[PDB]
Structure formats: structure tokens, C-alpha cells
Amino acid sequence: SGFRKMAFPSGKVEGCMVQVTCGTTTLNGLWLDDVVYCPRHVICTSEDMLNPNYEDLLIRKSNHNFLVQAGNVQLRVIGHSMQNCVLKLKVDTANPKTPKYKFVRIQPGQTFSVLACYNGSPSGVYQCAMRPNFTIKGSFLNGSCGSVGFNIDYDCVSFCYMHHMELPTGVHAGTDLAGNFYGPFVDRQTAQAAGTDTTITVNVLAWLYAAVINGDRWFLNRFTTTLNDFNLVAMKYNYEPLTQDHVDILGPLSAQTGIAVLDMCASLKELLQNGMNGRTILGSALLEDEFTPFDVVRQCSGVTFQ
Amino acid sequence: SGFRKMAFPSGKVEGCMVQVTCGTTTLNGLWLDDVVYCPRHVICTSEDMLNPNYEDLLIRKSNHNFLVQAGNVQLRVIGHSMQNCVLKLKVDTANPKTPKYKFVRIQPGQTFSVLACYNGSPSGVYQCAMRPNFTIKGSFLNGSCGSVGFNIDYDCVSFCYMHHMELPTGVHAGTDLAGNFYGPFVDRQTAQAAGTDTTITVNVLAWLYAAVINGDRWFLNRFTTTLNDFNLVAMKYNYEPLTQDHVDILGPLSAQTGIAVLDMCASLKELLQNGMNGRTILGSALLEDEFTPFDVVRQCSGVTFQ
Ligand SMILES: *[C@](O)(C(=O)NCCCCCC)[C@H](C[C@@H]1CCNC1=O)NC(=O)[C@@H]1[C@@H]2[C@H](CN1C(=O)[C@@H](NC(=O)NC(C)(C)C)C(C)(C)C)C2(C)C
Ligand SMILES: *[C@](O)(C(=O)NCCCCCC)[C@H](C[C@@H]1CCNC1=O)NC(=O)[C@@H]1[C@@H]2[C@H](CN1C(=O)[C@@H](NC(=O)NC(C)(C)C)C(C)(C)C)C2(C)C
């Protein structure tokens, strides 16, 4: 037993990280087959930086302007193209460590592992959620651009995030691996703010089920609630609406614990209305919302990756 | 910015995990050069299990009794020996993925990454501390024995933990990689209890410094305290004594933030005495004690591994 914020094993992604240097800018790239993916603002400088036109900026570049450093081995760029806000550098060598992979654009509320990197070298791995306001609460210092987020599904790495920038509230914004920002953000220094966030209700419920699976039983009650009456309480506390689809997804966990989803909603209602009164759940004094129903099942049943 | 429970990149350890099967028991082993390390209770059965004599049990074993499965490749055991509570299986093949490594026995309060594994396949990675009572609050299901904990220091993996068992409170006990249990535990089903735990004071202080580095400034105060007067308050709240050595270790963080260590102690004092009053620090409503001073510096300055 026990329940931890668990990341996927990072080895499959570690073997893909490279350093991309252009001009005075150095950041991380992702090397899959013979392509290196990195944020397009690597072609920017200290003054391009306020309102650049990346199409103009890129037409002015030559392949030899791109230093791609794969460990102590230099990779030669033989072509480049821009796809939305990512740059794709064609190199003459296919990454022999390329895992089976997919690029996926995730929905808010879904979680993923982030491999934080500097100068092409991994620093650490941690678990994140895509917040409802399309930011992530990451841990990113200067130089971390191009670090990626990912899930692993049996043997396949599903890349879902590449880091671009930090918002003045200390949260982070980035793109999918096809260069489309999550949320309304743009890779331009103009005023941008995250937008009001909300708590991921279906994930809180999953985590309460995790608690029950692990022996925290104390927040349960005899009551039930309707979805409607629950959602009226959730809105007051800035929680995302719970949909019948969320209820269906929580089915397996409800069946394993014997606690109907709507009964667990009645428990969440009382926790919102009464607080936790100096008690903890799974070692937290807050209601945790960065575990999906799938995360809970994976960790409570022991799914591996090969 | 941002601050997360960060694990080390796990790839160097993923390449060392194997499956060890003997009799009806299957667990994980660690393959370094031509040796596989695993818990000695792999030689146990459903009834050996209450009071085994592992020396007798092992003399009765043959090399061919040990199935070591490295992916879809079987490793032949050519020798075996017991070292305390770990079994060392000599195999005919050296692991080509063997990283630079050391075996280290850590002190309580020190943190490490755990690569949770089942059937030789990694499931997830998370960060732990060795509690003052020599347990760890892990996430371990049946089959996880032989998963290891580790730190990485530039290019060197320092293995510090191998998982053996779960205590009735849902916490975990194990050994160093030389098979010596942390704490008073034994690999025998007899009554054993963790012992009263305490909070790791020097780590809480490190995490408050992390908060200041990241812009949470609110818990600070104008006051100071003596070490003596601080430790009198810490004892009341079941905190470990803070030593002058801890104060010295916190020096760099104190110098970077401009907050004297004893001034941060005065802040911790008021947090213990007053609670947090519905506020959070670094996204937690509890005082966090599983970041060491080194963890904070590493994450707030961006140290990598190559
Ligand atoms: C990222 O570019 C990086 O790691 N680069 C390494 C090389 C030095 C700079 C190259 C451009 C970096 C990651 C940031 C740094 C701190 N935390 C992070 O996550 N991204 C950026 O530097 C992006 C980049 C340029 C600015 N920027 C920022 O993140 C800005 N933030 C904003 O300007 N935000 C608003 C636009 C919303 C106001 C800071 C101030 C944090 C540097 C672009 C946005 C093109
Ligand atoms: C570990 O052996 C394992 O993963 N093995 C896989 C093969 C099946 C059993 C082989 C022995 C397993 C990990 C445990 C399981 C649940 N959580 C874990 O961390 N360890 C054990 O099964 C150890 C092993 C035998 C019992 N045991 C336990 O952990 C016991 N706990 C205790 O008996 N604890 C006291 C001795 C303190 C009472 C449980 C009940 C959790 C199975 C030994 C201790 C030799």
C-alpha cells in the first residue's frame, strides 16, 4: 500500500534529450528518428523578444546556424521547418534510442510526467496536471525550455507537452509537440495572464477513492447526493462541473471500493462545507486534484511498462 | 520558478532491473556488472515465512533453482552468496547498461528516489525520505520487493535502499544494498512496529527557504530565537532536535535569501504555535519535511546529471 505522486520512469525520454543552440540562445530539444523538436523562440534574440515575426526570422536562418549537441556528439542540421510554435530540425542521424512514441494533445485535467532538463541533460522528473486554465504548476528555471511532458502506455511514450515560458504568477505555459499552445498563450512578450483556475473535481474524487483503497475511511458518510445538487455545491467552491461521463469513468474505482460515485460526491460535499478539521487524507491537508482515475488504478493495481 | 517533489531521472536504474524467480516467489533484482542483488527472502516459501533460517535454506539451494529474467533474455546463475539480508547471484553475463555506481547507507532525514518495479519492469518513480524511525512512506504493492532507492550525483548512481516489507501501519522497511536493514526490523514475520516517528526539522527549514526563494514570503517575522529556545519548542511538537551542524548546512540557503537560520527558526516556531490559518506554503497546507537542504539548492539552481 501507500500512495505517492508517481511519475513514469523517464529513461525512454532521457535518451531523446539534446541541446539546441542558436545565436546566444541555448535550450533543450527532443530527438526522435532524424528530427529534433524545440521551441521556435530559439531563433529569437534579446530584442526580437517583444514582438517577433518568426516566419521572417526563420527565412533568415541557415542550417549551420543551429548547434545541436547530443551529449559529446554534434548533430548536423540538414533542414528546418516551423510547425506552429515548434521548430523541427532535420538532422543527418536517426536517434538509435528513439522509443515507440506518439504525439498527443491532452485535455485539461489530465496528468503527465515532466522531465526537467538544462543544456540537454535531465535534472529531475515530476508529475503535473494540465490545469483547467491550461497552465501547469511546474518547476522550471531559465534554460528549461524544450523539456517535455509525457505519459507511457505499455511500451509507447505519448508526448503531450513542451515547455516554453513562465507566467507572472509562477505557473507555466507550453505547447503540444505539434507546437500548438495549451490555452490562449502566445510565444511573445506581451501581457498575458493565466485566467482563473478551478479544481479538477473528477480527480479529487479519484483521490478520495485512492484514500479508501489505502485505509483512510474517515471522510465517508451515510449520505448521498444528486449530480445536480452536487454540482451546485461544486460551483460555489470553484470546482469543475462533474459530468455523467466523469461518473462513468469513476465506475471501476466505485466498484472496487463498493462506494457509489454519488455517495463519494456526498463525502466531497461535506469536506468542502466543513473543511478537514485538522485531519489529513493520504498525507495531505488539502484536497488533491492531480491524480486522474487512471492514475489511481495504475498505482493501486501495479501496472508496469515494458 | 516553482517547487515540486522531484525524483532523479530513473533511466540509469531502469537498465539494471531484472526479475528473480525461485520456487513460487517472484520479485525484482538489481543487475550490476555480473551480479544480481535481491532480497534473501526469495528463497522462502509460504511456510518458511514465519521464522526461517536463511543459512539452512540457502545451503539447500542450487544455482539452477534461480530464474533470473532480464527482459526476454534468461540469465544463468553461476554462483550465489548471502550478505546480511540480500542475496547476490553471480551470473555469466555482465550488464552492459551498468552505470557508474556506489552503495551508500544513508542517515535518517536524507531523501532518495524510488523506482517501483513489478516482475522486473519499472512502474513509476517517486521521491522518499528515510524517516527518523527508519521506515519510508512508500507506495509498494505485492511484487515490489527488490525495487531500489537511489540518488544520482553527476554521473554516479548511489544506491541506498532495497525494498523488503510493509509494516501494519502501511509504511515500508528495507535494507541498504549490502542487506543491512534500516532500523530494528528483520525479514521475518514476527511482531514488529515502526516506532514513534518525528518530523525532520532541518528539512522543514530547507523547505521554508525554498518557499522564500519562490516568493512565498508570508510566514516570516521580525523575531529571532536561540537554538536552545527553538529546540524546546521543537520537542513539544515532536520535531527532531536542530543541531549546530544543521545550522551550518542551512548556511548557503540562508545566505542566498538573506534570512539568518535562527530567524527562519523563529518563523517555524510561530507556524508550529499558530498553525497556518488556512494558508498554504508551496501548495501544501502542512509543513513539508521530505526536502533536504541539498534538494532545495539542486532544484532552485538547476543542477543536472550527465
Ligand atoms: C526558456 O526560453 C528557456 O529555458 N530558455 C533558455 C535560454 C534563455 C532564454 C531563451 C529565450 C524560458 C523558460 C522560463 C525561464 C524562467 N522560467 C521559465 O519557464 N522561457 C522564456 O524565457 C520565455 C521566452 C521569452 C520570455 N520567456 C519567459 O518565460 C518570460 N515570461 C514572460 O515574458 N511571460 C509573459 C510573456 C506572459 C509576460 C520570463 C520573464 C519568465 C523570462 C519567451 C516568452 C519567448
Ligand atoms: C515482497 O516480498 C514482494 O514484493 N514479493 C513478491 C512475491 C510475493 C511474496 C514474496 C515473499 C513483499 C512486498 C510487500 C507486499 C505488500 N507491500 C509490500 O511492501 N514483501 C513481503 O511480502 C514481506 C516478506 C514476508 C512478508 N512480507 C510483508 O511485507 C508482510 N508484512 C509483514 O509480515 N510485516 C511484519 C513482519 C512486520 C508483521 C505483508 C503482510 C505486508 C505481506 C517478508 C517479511 C519475509
How was this structure obtained? X-ray
Torsion of CA B30, B33, B34, B36, to 10 degrees: -10
CA-only gyration radius of chain A, Å: 22
Q: Which DSSP letter does residue A49 get?
A: G
Residues in chain B: 306
Q: Residue B250 corresponds to which cell in the numbers above?
A: 542551512
Question: What are the CB-based long-range contacts (under 8 Å, 24+) for A220-229?
Answer: A220/A259, A220/A263, A220/A267, A221/A266, A221/A267, A221/A270, A223/A263, A223/A266, A223/A267, A223/A269, A223/A270, A224/A260, A224/A262, A224/A263, A224/A265, A224/A266, A225/A262, A225/A265, A225/A266, A225/A269, A226/A262, A227/A262, A227/A265
Q: B258 in the Ramachandran plot: left (φ > 0), alpha (ψ -120 to 50) or beta?
A: left
Q: If DSSP codes are grouped into helix, strand and coil, which group holds residue B284?
A: strand
Residue whose C-alpha cell reads 536517426 in the numeric block: A94
CB atoms within 10 A of CB B59: 9
Choose one of A142, A147, A185 to mutate for the ligand 1 pocket test, by most ligand atoms within 8 angstroms of C-beta: A142
Q: Which residues are bridge partners to B114 per DSSP?
A: B126, B149
Q: Which amino acid is at A279?
A: R
Contact criterion met (CB below 8 Å) for B149 and B159: yes
CB atoms within 10 A of CB B248: 11
CB atoms within 10 A of CB A21: 17
Q: Residue A287 corresponds to which cell in the numbers above?
A: 484536497
Contact criterion met (CB below 8 Å) for A60 and A48: no
Residue whose C-alpha cell reads 526563494 in the numeric block: B213
Of B169, B170, B172, nearest to B161 (Cα)?
B172
Return the H-helix or E-strand segment holding A30.
strand A25-32
Find the A173 Cα to ligand 1 centroid distance in Å.
10
Cα(A37)–Cα(A31) distance, integer angstroms:
7
Q: Residue A184 corresponds to which cell in the numbers above?
A: 490562449
Please tell me the number of Cα atoms within 13 Å of B109 on its side-chain side. 18
Cα(A257)–Cα(A266) distance, integer angstroms:
15
Cα(A122)–Cα(A119) distance, integer angstroms:
8
Cα(B205)–Cα(B211) distance, integer angstroms:
10
Nearest CA in chain A to B140: A1
Helix, strand and coil content of chain A, in percent to the nearest 5, comes to 25, 30, 45
The alpha carbon of residue A63 and the mean position of all alpha carbons in its chain are separated, in whole angstroms, by 31
Nearest CA to CA, how far is A125 from chain B (Å)?
Answer: 5
Q: B9 in the Ramachandran plot: left (φ > 0), alpha (ψ -120 to 50) or beta?
A: beta
Residue whose C-alpha cell reads 527508519 in the numeric block: B134
Contact criterion met (CB below 8 Å) for A7 and A125: yes
Of B96, B59, B100, B101, nearest to B75 (Cα)?
B96
Q: What's A241's domain CATH number?
A: 1.10.1840.10
Q: Cβ A121–B280 below 8 Å, yes or no?
A: no
Contacts of A213 in chain B (CB under 8 A): none
Range of B252's domain? 201-301
Task: Among B4, B118, B125, select the one facing A304 at the smallest CB separation.
Answer: B118
Q: Residue B24 corresponds to which cell in the numbers above?
A: 513460487
Q: Residue A239 corresponds to which cell in the numbers above?
A: 470546482
Cα(B60)–Cα(B272) distance, integer angstroms:
56
Q: Cβ A305–B123 below 8 Å, yes or no?
A: yes
**Is A26 close to ligand 1, i.e. is its CB under 6 Å away?**
yes
Q: What is the maximal distance between C-alpha atoms in chain A?
A: 69
Q: Which amino acid is at A163?
A: H
Q: What's B35's domain CATH number?
A: 2.40.10.10
With a CB cutoff of 8 Å and minimum separation 6, the contacts of B177 are: B30, B37, B86, B103, B148, B159, B160, B161, B162
Find the A22 Cα to ligand 1 centroid distance in Å.
16
Cα(B81)–Cα(B55) distance, integer angstroms:
10
List, as one string, the DSSP characters of B225-255.
--HHHHHHHHHHTTBPPPPHHHHHHTHHHHH
Contact criterion met (CB below 8 Å) for A38 and A86: yes
Task: Among B170, B298, B304, select the one facing A122 at the smallest CB separation.
Answer: B304
